[PDB]
Symmetry: D2
Subunit: 400 residues, 4 copies
């Protein structure tokens, strides 16, 4: 299970002061550059760009492809923060999001036209935890000269999945999650594979083909070759729109990256064990996790993930007797179970070293019985023991 990734996450971008300085300066960012190269190296990309958040990394990524009058094609299985960004905020920019339920390859193609500037996927989709069929979707997007953008947040900076290996062109990360690993720092990363042939599609992507008025009349394809996309995103979009990552955030996230494979491995082993334990528990109706045999999209998971199946799972708790008669929400077995955990923390992030839970129906396909768990790196027996005592307290004196 140890591999070269362990070396890369400590050395890529550090060429020759051993720790990298916080260049807290406006004027002459080396700290962000190390981070960028390291995540590039871990993803199997050519270059990367750091921005102030996951949401910013997704925003710039798409705005570097699509302009007013354009469209993008996305899975409907969206991290809920991405869904509003797409359907609502992007619409105010004249960018139309088109959603393909299920991920039959020919369903994608039926909404393609010449104004389609990206296909957008998530490595592990919220909230059915389906892994996309990267090869089929990439073949069909590339056939029509459309680049593929993948949110690989749940791939933990490349540890569980490197979608560039399966043909993805652009990868985005909420580094806020597993890359940082400690719930201290918000950040995003955009990674360019450097393999999408912009030159073949000068009319679809004029931003790389035509002199850039905003950058000394540079033709990005001529001046930067295969890095045209990421250079344009840096020199025009980041410059003009300004979601830059603070060097202190760059520093903290570099600290996390140094232990990424160790943390992620443990997150995955703990999540698979917790998911298996929940599934056999008499308190639980169902569990959703990509590493369970019972998972529908397990075939893709097995093919495209490695070293495990991600840090996150969902499960439903069985009802208290008199389930639907109870007029009060908070008194339902899901919210109760969350309120009685002592180890797990009730809050909305994922990718902390600490185990985190949320019961969606009660604050933020959301049923009342549903608990989402970002599984931490605590001792698995204490994690399980925490759920068990919560179940016990909630179903107090009353078989499961």
């Amino acid at each position: 299970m140890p591999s070269h990734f362990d070396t890369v996450q400590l050395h890529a971008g550090q060429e020759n002061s051993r720790a990298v300085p916080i260049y807290a300066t406006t004027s002459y960012n080396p700290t962000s550059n190390v981070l960028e190269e390291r995540i590039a190296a871990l993803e199997g990309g050519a270059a990367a760009l750091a921005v102030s958040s996951g949401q910013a990394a997704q925003t710039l990524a798409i705005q570097g492809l699509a302009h007013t009058g354009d469209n993008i094609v996305s899975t409907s299985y969206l991290y809920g923060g991405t869904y509003n960004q797409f359907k609502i905020s992007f619409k105010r920019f004249g960018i139309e999001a088109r959603f393909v339920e299920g991920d039959n390859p020919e369903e994608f193609e039926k909404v393609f036209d010449e104004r389609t500037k990206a296909v957008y996927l998530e490595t592990i989709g919220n909230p059915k935890y389906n892994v996309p069929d990267f090869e089929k979707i990439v073949a069909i997007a590339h056939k029509h000269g459309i680049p593929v953008v993948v949110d690989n947040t749940f791939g933990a900076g490349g540890y569980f999945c490197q979608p560039i290996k399966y043909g993805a062109d652009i990868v985005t990360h909420s580094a806020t999650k597993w890359i940082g690993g400690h719930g201290t720092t918000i950040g995003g990363i955009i990674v360019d594979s450097g393999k999408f042939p912009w030159k073949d599609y000068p009319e679809k992507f004029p931003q790389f083909s035509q002199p850039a008025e905003g950058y000394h009349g540079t033709i990005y394809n001529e001046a930067y070759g295969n890095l045209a996309y990421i250079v344009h995103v840096r020199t025009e979009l980041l410059r003009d729109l300004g979601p830059l990552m603070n060097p202190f955030a760059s520093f903290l996230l570099l600290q996390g990256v140094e232990t990424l494979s160790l943390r992620a491995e443990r997150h995955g082993e703990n999540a698979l064990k917790l998911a298996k334990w929940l599934e056999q528990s008499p308190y639980v109706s169902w569990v959703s996790y990509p590493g369970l045999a019972s998972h529908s999209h397990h075939e893709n998971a097995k093919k495209y993930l490695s070293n495990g199946f991600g840090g996150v799972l969902s499960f439903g708790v069985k009802d208290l007797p008199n389930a639907d008669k109870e007029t009060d929400p908070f008194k339902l077995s899901g919210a109760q179970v969350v309120d009685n955990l002592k180890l797990a923390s009730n809050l909305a992030n994922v990718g902390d070293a600490k185990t985190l839970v949320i019961a969606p129906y009660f604050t933020t396909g959301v049923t009342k019985d549903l608990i989402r768990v970002s599984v931490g790196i605590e001792f698995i027996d204490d994690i399980i023991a925490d759920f068990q005592q919560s179940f016990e307290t909630v179903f107090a004196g009353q078989k499961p």
Copy 2:
């Protein structure tokens, strides 16, 4: 000079640990909140929002007003980065920037239609340091139901000018400059006056009057009344597009604010004394600074600024013999003066406590003789002596 500003910059938002904790967390920003409240109070606004840069402040401020198909109307006296942002970047979003030379208010009205969603000004415009006629431009924009957005970066956090006092609706700052004060930290702020009556223009500004699909069906005008703009910018745009200020940035900027009035006063007084001296120098051909009586906009400057005239001036250095015959740039007198400076630092920021100079034709009204100076809070005799010794070097073996 001392005023209640001195008290506010230390106490607004810390009404109730004596220093403000850096809450480097993702999950449950309070440092950001103190900064926002403090800049709001100094500018006389109702509320504010901190974001990752000045560029982002301007981007979100406009994107909270204008959607694709809309237009905005702007002075053409723009900060370099605002120009490309407006001309090139906003165009990709379907927002048309209409530029209007001079500060005749009839030039503004000329280019209004009912899809005009903002008028945009700079308190002290670049590169000629023109202060606009706030009263007249506001009057005419408000007549047509159009809100006025003012980049008050050169007003130093409200110290040299509070555009809201003259009817501005929205104020944006590069907090990177004088607010921070030390060249360490990038950051932006948006300040809402809360005096623009969104309710009276339900169709020009649908984002405040129609149910927000991306925010639980809320009608911002109904739920948040006079704070509809700023709440929308926060809960929709900031959330979806993601240019968040890091808490370490919030923290350092808060430290700068606490001395803003002390610093800005000294920047003002030093700039004026440098300007007057350059105006008597045999080595100078012209000087541009709003507090000089010879400046074309000296009247507006006197009426809308107070406590001084800002920290930035430009001047032209006398030509050396063979100036147009000279083919090589670096031997032009401007580049040579900048090269021989010892105290001043050659870089592009403004608003550092250190004095900074740039000869924009020899790096980035961009004529060959032109030196721009952001005048620092060094002892004035040391700043002057620095220019003097360089002039002497550059022009040696001649007659001043």
Copy 3:
């Protein structure tokens, strides 16, 4: 009023990235070195050393001179924490502190013996704010081959007093106070004049004259000449005993240093004005401030202080009716006034930009009527008004 000091506090040690990096590194401090060189220049010293606290700066400074069996001679007008340090902690190290009273030099001579390794002064002593007669005490210490160590904390980093200019050998600072300026960061500085002739006293100070076994047999006097003291303190004491300043602290203190003269000037000016105003107040029995003619050591203050008289003052509030008939402490006017302050903050620090108060008799001569103010840089009229409204409340229904 402005002087070269304003240039020095921005430029010294920044030799040739505009801001100084945070080198958060164990291995290869540069940030620290800038702070050191800058405070040395501000104090007219040859070199300096940064350490984790004012208490650490005092400890190492003394342990750089005195060993077990030795004594030092100190004013008894000690900041509270220095007294315990000296009388109690130093004793466990076999260093005996001898406390001399008043300013008279002859009393100094009487307790001097061949094992006296230092004389210790404070620039403004607690809590009577008496300034020492530097010239007489230095003359009589130097006659006996004894160096003078001065805690110049209340000197505000050289702004109000540079004791080295009156012959002091070694100056220490709690940089926690005026040097940082914001109550955020704890730190200490030791400054060496480089002017004490260690070579003339090889027996009194063997640590500079005998091969140092702890440092490869170096004789500090030969290898480092006039810097023997500070090099010995760095390379032996800091190394072995370990009170090192973290580079983040170094960074924040440097930011404060950049406005030192502006803050200190305002603190001094506001304290004098407050002091005068309290004196004429009929709620006030007495006022102690070095810049009042009423002060007993006024003449030392005017000879050795410049640009003002420090940031700190004490005063007595007149008794309420039933003065000695109150056996409840908290009903006395002193405590009542601090509780009804709205702008001032009640805590034990000095040197914050904000106004700080304490009634030491009701938590930390220390009489029942006494309030200690560290006067901030708020608008003076707001500070005064805060006292008045407090007075009026406490004395409501009763004459001044």
Copy 4:
């Protein structure tokens, strides 16, 4: 391998903002408080104190036991910096360090007298990695009423050893090393088991028995019972002597602790494998690591360590021809091996996630051939391959 240590390292001290705020304040440290409770829980201690560095932790730890005229008794197998501290700087304090070669209990006893205030040991001693016989040495120390102080730095925060379970009284750490884990942050920890019965030695330890003049006449043994040591060290020594830990360092170290078990396990496993590999190399003359069967102390090591044998090893490289005629020491083989390493970094720290090497003859038992290696958590094959390619280069064109 995974255990409860994994939960404790995440949760101890964070009872109920999910991330710990950085309280950068001088006035009212909770960040340090979390780190102290955590390291105490990981060591099996009652309480702990954070200080500016490991050197400071060792200094205050001893100064809280021994006063002028006292002695302590110490292994001779000391980390370099400790030896100078003990032999030289402590002597200036009137504390005599009595060094006891070897690890026979009885040799400790022969230098005990009634002024012996500590026995000081190291978990893995330098420079030959000997583990002391804890049980035997604690029994003879405690028989004479002497507390045992253990530098457990190389125990990695309790992961490889918890000396308190073997009867140690006080444990110190350089948290600079594995606790922190990234070479970013300097710090120390003192841990008190709360088991040493101070009340039975009121004259050997008057600091806990006699009213404390430096702290309100308190008798630590009465007011604080079994926590008298750690409270006296905090409220008197830390307060007067001032080696405070900055909250930024607290925060960074807390982040490191959250991955301690995962890092330390990989360090231990990587060192053992590198050790074994070195043992099959034709370029190596000897290897020293506690986990090898050939190590002199292998039995103590097996008894008192667990989960591995620590992260550091040393070895000696064969000479190149003409050792003795070489007059440039950078042309010797140990130096050349270090110079040709690509992955390993040449510097003095240990306990970084990166592999570090030093050949101490060429910089800081120190012989020509010695390389010390702090083995990092890179992929072991990369680490081995680095040494191999280095040997291949240095000894190119030769017999092996």
